[PDB]
């Protein structure tokens, strides 16, 4: 669903889906190739 | 008939092997290339 | 041993420096550096 975001105070728009690759456990989020957050990871559990 | 045939069987075996001679082409597209990656690159600077 | 008769093994180390350089950095789809370039040596 497209919803608005605030994550971490964090804001943005977009639809979360599972991400099927190999992240660090200390990543908060990363960036595009654009320089903007297209993925972030979950506060409460460990999912990004 | 002996000339020609063989003439256009060069041209063949030309654009099969060197493929700089459709890079006047091939600077349409690369031209093109960095014009859609300029406009990505501007969105991660800060202007300020 | 088998501070006076306290005998070791055999191991090295190093200490290196740092400058204030910019380096290239090559991403992968992993998330791990294949390859770096500093541009001021070359």
């Known amino acids: 669903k497209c919803v608005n975001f605030n994550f971490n105070g964090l804001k943005g728009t977009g639809v979360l889906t599972e991400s099927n690759k190999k992240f660090l456990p200390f990543q908060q989020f990363g960036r595009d190739i654009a320089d903007t957050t297209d993925a972030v990871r979950d506060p409460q559990t460990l999912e990004i | ?48 | ?42």
């Open chain 2, 1 to 48: 008939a002996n000339q020609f045939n063989s003439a256009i069987g060069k041209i063949q075996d030309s654009l099969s092997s060197t493929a700089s001679a459709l890079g006047k082409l091939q600077d349409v597209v690369n031209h093109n290339a960095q014009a859609l990656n300029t406009l990505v690159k501007q969105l991660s600077s800060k202007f300020g």
């Open chain 3, 1 to 42: 041993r088998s501070s006076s008769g306290w005998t070791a093994g055999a191991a090295a180390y190093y200490v290196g420096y740092l400058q204030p350089r910019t380096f290239l950095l090559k991403y992968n789809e992993n998330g791990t550096i294949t390859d770096a370039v500093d541009c001021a040596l070359d």
